Design an enzyme around this catalytic site. Sequence first.
Site, mmCIF file in Angstrom:
data_model
loop_
_atom_site.group_PDB
_atom_site.id
_atom_site.type_symbol
_atom_site.label_atom_id
_atom_site.label_comp_id
_atom_site.label_asym_id
_atom_site.label_seq_id
_atom_site.Cartn_x
_atom_site.Cartn_y
_atom_site.Cartn_z
ATOM 1 N N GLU B 60 16.723 -8.880 -10.810
ATOM 2 C CA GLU B 60 15.831 -8.392 -9.771
ATOM 3 C C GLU B 60 14.563 -9.244 -9.777
ATOM 4 O OE1 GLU B 60 13.075 -5.486 -10.074
ATOM 5 O OE2 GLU B 60 13.619 -4.300 -8.321
ATOM 6 N N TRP B 82 18.432 -2.201 -4.724
ATOM 7 C CA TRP B 82 17.904 -2.190 -3.363
ATOM 8 C C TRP B 82 18.851 -1.788 -2.224
ATOM 9 C CZ3 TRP B 82 12.657 -2.966 -2.587
ATOM 10 C CH2 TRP B 82 11.936 -3.373 -3.725
ATOM 11 N N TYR B 146 9.021 -7.787 -2.239
ATOM 12 C CA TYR B 146 8.192 -8.567 -3.154
ATOM 13 C C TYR B 146 8.416 -10.076 -3.074
ATOM 14 C CZ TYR B 146 7.016 -3.974 -4.909
ATOM 15 O OH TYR B 146 6.623 -2.654 -4.981
ATOM 16 N N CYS B 198 4.807 -0.454 -4.338
ATOM 17 C CA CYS B 198 4.311 0.365 -5.447
ATOM 18 C C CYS B 198 3.420 -0.503 -6.331
ATOM 19 C CB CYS B 198 5.471 0.913 -6.296
ATOM 20 S SG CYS B 198 6.200 2.437 -5.656
ATOM 21 N N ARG B 218 0.006 1.657 -7.812
ATOM 22 C CA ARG B 218 -0.491 2.813 -7.072
ATOM 23 C C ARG B 218 0.288 4.112 -7.265
ATOM 24 N NH1 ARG B 218 2.185 4.650 -3.193
ATOM 25 N NH2 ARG B 218 3.909 3.516 -2.188
ATOM 26 N N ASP B 221 6.851 6.621 -11.247
ATOM 27 C CA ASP B 221 7.763 7.646 -11.720
ATOM 28 C C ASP B 221 7.839 7.351 -13.215
ATOM 29 O OD1 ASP B 221 10.007 9.039 -12.625
ATOM 30 O OD2 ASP B 221 11.177 8.559 -10.824
HETATM 31 O O1 UMP Z 1 9.871 0.366 -9.759
HETATM 32 C C1 UMP Z 1 9.394 1.410 -9.320
HETATM 33 C C2 UMP Z 1 9.487 1.816 -7.922
HETATM 34 C C3 UMP Z 1 8.990 3.059 -7.509
HETATM 35 N N1 UMP Z 1 8.437 3.892 -8.383
HETATM 36 C C4 UMP Z 1 8.292 5.275 -7.855
HETATM 37 C C5 UMP Z 1 6.886 5.836 -7.644
HETATM 38 C C6 UMP Z 1 7.175 7.110 -6.862
HETATM 39 O O2 UMP Z 1 7.881 8.032 -7.727
HETATM 40 C C7 UMP Z 1 8.148 6.712 -5.750
HETATM 41 C C8 UMP Z 1 7.392 6.128 -4.552
HETATM 42 O O3 UMP Z 1 6.648 7.186 -3.830
HETATM 43 P P1 UMP Z 1 5.441 6.831 -2.830
HETATM 44 O O4 UMP Z 1 4.352 6.384 -3.688
HETATM 45 O O5 UMP Z 1 5.824 5.741 -1.920
HETATM 46 O O6 UMP Z 1 4.939 7.974 -1.998
HETATM 47 O O7 UMP Z 1 8.891 5.623 -6.496
HETATM 48 C C9 UMP Z 1 8.277 3.557 -9.750
HETATM 49 O O8 UMP Z 1 7.699 4.224 -10.598
HETATM 50 N N2 UMP Z 1 8.768 2.325 -10.160
#
Ligand code: UMP
Lengths: 316, 316
Positions: B60, B82, B146, B198, B218, B221
């Site tokens: 990735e 993706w 990205y 993100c 920003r 998870d």
């Molecule tokens: O590599 C990644 C991609 C996404 N997120 C998570 C953050 C949020 O749980 C969700 C995106 O929600 P929004 O911020 O777009 O509202 O995906 C991660 O932690 N790591």
Amino acid sequence: MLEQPYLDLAKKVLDEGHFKPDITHTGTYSIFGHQMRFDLSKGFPLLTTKKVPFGLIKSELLWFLHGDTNIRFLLQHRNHIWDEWAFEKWVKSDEYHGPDMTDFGHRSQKDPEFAAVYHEEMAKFDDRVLHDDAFAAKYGDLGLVYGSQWRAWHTSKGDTIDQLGDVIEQIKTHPYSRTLIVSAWNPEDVPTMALPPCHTLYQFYVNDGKLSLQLYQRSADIFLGVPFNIASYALLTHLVAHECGLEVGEFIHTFGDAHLYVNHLDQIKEQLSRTPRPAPTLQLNPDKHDIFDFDMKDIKLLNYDPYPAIKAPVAV
Amino acid sequence: MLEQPYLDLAKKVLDEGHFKPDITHTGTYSIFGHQMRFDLSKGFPLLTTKKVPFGLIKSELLWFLHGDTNIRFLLQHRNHIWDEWAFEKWVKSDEYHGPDMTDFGHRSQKDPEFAAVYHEEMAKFDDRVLHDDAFAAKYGDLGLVYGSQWRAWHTSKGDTIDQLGDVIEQIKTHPYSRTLIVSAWNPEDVPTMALPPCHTLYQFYVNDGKLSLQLYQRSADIFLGVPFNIASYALLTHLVAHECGLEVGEFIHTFGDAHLYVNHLDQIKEQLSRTPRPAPTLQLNPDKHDIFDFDMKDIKLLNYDPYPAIKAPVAV
Ligand SMILES: O=c1ccn([C@H]2C[C@H](O)[C@@H](COP(=O)(O)O)O2)c(=O)[nH]1
Ligand SMILES: O=c1ccn([C@H]2C[C@H](O)[C@@H](COP(=O)(O)O)O2)c(=O)[nH]1
Ligand SMILES: [K+]
Ligand SMILES: [K+]
């Protein structure tokens, strides 16, 4: 996708090209005898799997078109493609009062300090050509280049033949002529030339009001040269068809010795992992039809959204 | 142990994160404003308290590096991270001739029968992208991802900016620059995007010949995303330092909204009962230095001996 033929060429050479050593032994994998064809009705064959500076091919082509052979025009448009060939003579002369500069294109790469002295002597040279008409007329004139071969072929009778101009005329009056050929290979000049013409000759062909062109290239650097070459002659086909009021046909690229320099192996492999995007569209100024009087603003490219540019060592 | 910062983050959210509802109300416990730092000289921060598929982060990352935005590359390496974003467009189009597929990622979970129809339509899609260049160029291209943000930032002048490439250059010539930043947040695209970036932006920093990197995320998870995120940017730091001939410094992970989905509560608690093992060591191919032309075989991980993988419901 339109550019597929080029990607296929890369693959074939990678797994079928045989190791052949050239003058400097950078090393090459090559095949002999190859033909690709592009349908210009589907789009302009400017590679999308790698950004190619169209401005450079546009100004270099116009340069040839005007029958110009003087570097100055190129520099005026920030085109340093032909510099080293002119700079070479400036160094190997009587007025040159500076560092050795011998084997510069090679010594530079093998010396981050020479690459600077050379870089400057070159810079000064480019400036003098840009402002000293006498210096320009002496060291800026390349003499035997595509511009003069195409439009100022010297005869044994001290006269000049405008091969292109004449052929465009023959296209308008005798569309089905099987002798619509422009050659850049002159046997009496070739053995003295620093760089005999790579793009040996090209033939035009008309059918169903569409104009096609076949290009015989005696030698081709697959990674570096070919992407520029495809666009150049695909552009010419559009222009000559614009003046003749014909619709676009096909671009047939024929190869003699097509090679891949051993030092570009990873860059091409990388490029191959890329998936082609839709081809850009060309747009020629409708009001102007005398392609010999065309300008940079007259040729417009659209929807070209390439991948990042790949960096590779120019073999020498 | 190296991964401790991540385990501490999990604890803090568990007993200090406040209940905040998101779009789908899976439910989250979250904090805002957090910073962890990893010393890459001690080892690669790949979680050991839970097996993480490094192959997925390696391919990735390379995908981004090549400035690629087409799914095909990922599938060629068995990376289905993706897919759904591309598949989404294939369904919501004119050529789609099959079952509704509306709200698939949700309906699937709430229906063991839909999870099968969807599973197949997806399978067929992945195949078409893998062999139909036209289909690939149309539904496989994600566009704004990205890879294109980092290396093909579109300007108002119809040109493209290679943010990464330029910054790596600025690192080599101006190591102490406080403006070595790559941003993925474009205000004119963000409001239309299906998933705004993100990983908003990251900054490089050189000192004592060591290269560090700070990443502003920003949204994160904690259970599912973060373990992948740590490794990704810890890898980048190694690569960019490989090309620049610098030794590894630190990875600073800054968080905006770090959350734990209420449905991952027991999986994380379980993971927390696990005692970290020694971190694995990364090993980059010494002969190759152009990170843009790196391949899967060029990056090697060593001594990664994790605990069993934890299974959790991907909140949606
Ligand atoms: O590599 C990644 C991609 C996404 N997120 C998570 C953050 C949020 O749980 C969700 C995106 O929600 P929004 O911020 O777009 O509202 O995906 C991660 O932690 N790591
Ligand atoms: O636009 C160009 C100009 C040159 N060449 C390459 C072909 C060879 O790599 C080298 C010329 O070598 P000789 O054929 O002259 O020996 O330059 C191209 O492919 N495209
Ligand atoms: K001839
Ligand atoms: K920004």
